[PDB]
C-alpha cells in the first residue's frame, strides 16, 4: 500500500493479476490509486436499488441450496446470490483477489496446476484457483475481485433456499436468521456480507464496494463450527 508501483515501474506484488483496461471511461483504474477520492454522490441512488431484509418474505421449511443460476445483477447489494466459485483466468482479473474465511485472504496467481506464478498475470495460462467449499471442512465462503473492464465480480456459496419461490423470495447468502431461524452465516454465508448490513472490512473493500465508504467499522465475532473469528466488519446502521 505504501508504493503501489515500485521503483522499477512495476506493481509491488507480482503475484497480483494486473490486466486492467479502462476502455469504457469509468475511471475505475484511477480510483485504484486514489481510492479516498471516490466521488460518492451517486451512492444514494445505487444503494436505493437494494431492499432491506425486512422487505423480504418470511421463509419456512427445511433449507436447501441454490442451483438455479438466475439472471441476477448488482453484487453491491447484500442479497445478491452468487454462483459457486471456480477457477478464473488471470487475463480477466484486475487487482488482488480476496476470499473470506470469513476473514480476508488473498489468492495469488498460479499456473493451472497450482504452482505459484509471479508475472502479474500476463501469461494467458495463469489462473486464480478460487474453488470454494464452506468451512470448517472447506476453505472460504466466497470471493470478490475486479475484472479488466472495471466491474465488481463475486462468487461463493452456494446461497440458501429459505422457502417459497417468486416475486419476494430471499435466496440467503449471509446470516438471515431474521427470515429463517436456521439461515445462519455458517449455513448460508457466501462471501464478505456478514449480515444484511455488514460486510467484512479488508484492504480493498473501498475499491470493490466503494459506496460503503459510508459504513462504520465494528469489531465483530464470528463462530464457524467452533473456531472463533474476530474480524472487522463495516456496517450500515445509521
Amino acid at each position: 500500500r505504501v508504493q503501489l508501483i515500485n521503483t522499477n515501474g512495476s506493481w509491488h506484488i507480482n503475484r497480483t493479476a494486473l490486466n486492467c483496461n479502462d476502455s469504457l471511461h469509468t475511471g475505475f483504474l484511477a480510483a485504484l490509486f486514489y481510492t479516498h477520492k471516490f466521488n460518492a454522490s451517486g451512492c444514494p441512488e445505487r444503494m436505493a436499488h437494494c431492499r432491506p431484509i425486512d422487505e423480504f418474505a418470511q421463509g419456512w421449511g427445511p433449507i436447501t441450496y441454490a442451483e438455479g443460476h438466475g439472471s441476477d445483477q448488482r453484487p453491491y447489494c447484500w442479497h445478491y446470490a452468487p454462483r459457486q466459485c471456480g477457477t478464473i483466468p488471470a487475463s480477466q482479473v484486475c487487482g488482488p483477489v480476496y476470499c473470506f474465511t470469513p476473514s480476508p485472504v488473498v489468492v495469488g496467481t498460479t499456473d493451472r496446476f497450482g504452482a505459484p506464478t509471479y508475472t502479474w498475470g500476463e501469461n494467458e495460462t495463469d489462473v486464480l484457483i478460487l474453488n470454494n467449499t464452506r468451512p470448517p471442512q472447506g476453505n472460504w465462503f466466497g470471493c470478490t475481485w475486479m475484472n479488466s473492464t472495471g466491474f465488481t465480480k463475486t462468487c461463493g456459496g452456494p446461497p440458501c433456499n429459505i422457502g417459497g419461490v417468486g416475486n419476494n423470495t430471499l435466496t440467503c447468502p449471509t446470516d438471515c436468521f431474521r427470515k429463517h431461524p436456521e439461515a445462519t452465516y455458517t449455513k448460508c454465508g457466501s462471501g464478505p456480507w456478514l449480515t444484511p448490513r455488514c460486510l467484512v472490512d479488508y484492504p480493498y473493500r473501498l475499491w470493490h464496494y466503494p459506496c460503503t465508504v459510508n459504513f462504520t467499522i465494528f469489531k465483530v465475532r464470528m463462530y464457524v463450527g467452533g473456531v472463533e473469528h474476530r474480524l472487522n466488519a463495516a456496517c450500515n446502521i445509521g
Epitope: 494486473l18 483496461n21 479502462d22 484511477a30 480510483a31 486514489y34 477520492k37 508475472t119
Partner: antibody, heavy 125, light 108 residues
C-alpha cells in the same frame, strides 16, 4: 463521461499574468489528474505542468517559477496561472485528464483523455 | 527532462502509401509512450498508447512499435482523412514531454 470546461479567452498586456481555470464534473473522483499543455499559433505542443488528485504539482523545466497550478475540490476546478507574460506566450492553453487507463505486464499507463475545449491567450500591447 | 525527437517534421504522401514516423527518446522510457493525432483547429486525441496499443475506434492501418528509446508510428495505407500532425509523448516521467510533431499532407 468526465467533462473539462476551461474559461473564456484572455487578452493581456506584456508583463502581466493570466489564470486559466479548468472545471471537471460528471466522474467518479472528486479531483482528477489534471495536466496542462499549450500550443502557439501554428506551433507544436508544449507541456507545462500537472497536478495529482491529492494536489501534488509537477512542472516542466522551462516554466518553473513562472507557472503555478492550484486546485479547488469544492467546485472540482483546477487553475493554471502564468506570470511575466511575453508576446511569445500567445497560445491556446489546454487542460486534460492524465489518469491511469491501462495496466499490463505489471505496469500501468497514463495518457491525455478527455481534453478541455481550450483557452486562447493573446499577449500584446 | 526527457527530450523526444520526431522525424521528419513534414511529410507528403500519396493515398495508399506507407508512412513511417520516428520518435527517439533521450533516455530509456521502456514503453511509456503515447501517440496523439491532431487535426488543425481541434484538440489532439490519442490513437496509440503504451508504445503499441491501438486506442478504441482507430483504424488498424495505424500501428505503433518500439521499446526503450526508438519508437515508430506506421500508417500502412494512407487515407484522405489521415491528414494531421502527429505527436509522440513519453509518460515515463511525471514531467511529460512531447515530440516536435509530424505534419502529413496528401500528395497529388
Amino acid at each position: 463521461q468526465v467533462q473539462l470546461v476551461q474559461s473564456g479567452a484572455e487578452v493581456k498586456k506584456p508583463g502581466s499574468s493570466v489564470k486559466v481555470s479548468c472545471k471537471a464534473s460528471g466522474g467518479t473522483l472528486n479531483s482528477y489528474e489534471i495536466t496542462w499543455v499549450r500550443q502557439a499559433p501554428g506551433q507544436g505542443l508544449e507541456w507545462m505542468g500537472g497536478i495529482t488528485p491529492i494536489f501534488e504539482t509537477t512542472y516542466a523545466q522551462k516554466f518553473q517559477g513562472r507557472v503555478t497550478i492550484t486546485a479547488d475540490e469544492s467546485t472540482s476546478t483546477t487553475y493554471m496561472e502564468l506570470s511575466s507574460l511575453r508576446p511569445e506566450d500567445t497560445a491556446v492553453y489546454y487542460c486534460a485528464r492524465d489518469g491511469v487507463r491501462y495496466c499490463g505486464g505489471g505496469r500501468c499507463y497514463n495518457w491525455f483523455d478527455p481534453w478541455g475545449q481550450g483557452t486562447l491567450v493573446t499577449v500584446s500591447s | 527532462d526527457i527530450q523526444m525527437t520526431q522525424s521528419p517534421s513534414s511529410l507528403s504522401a500519396s493515398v495508399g502509401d506507407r508512412v513511417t514516423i520516428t520518435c527517439r527518446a533521450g533516455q530509456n522510457i521502456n514503453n511509456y509512450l503515447n501517440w496523439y493525432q491532431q487535426k488543425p483547429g481541434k484538440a489532439p486525441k490519442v490513437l496509440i498508447y503504451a508504445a503499441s496499443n491501438l486506442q478504441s475506434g482507430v483504424p488498424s492501418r495505424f500501428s505503433g512499435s518500439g521499446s526503450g528509446t526508438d519508437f515508430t508510428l506506421t500508417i500502412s495505407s494512407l487515407q484522405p482523412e489521415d491528414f494531421a500532425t502527429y505527436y509522440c509523448q513519453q509518460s515515463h516521467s511525471t514531467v511529460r514531454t512531447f515530440g516536435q510533431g509530424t505534419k502529413v499532407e496528401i500528395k497529388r
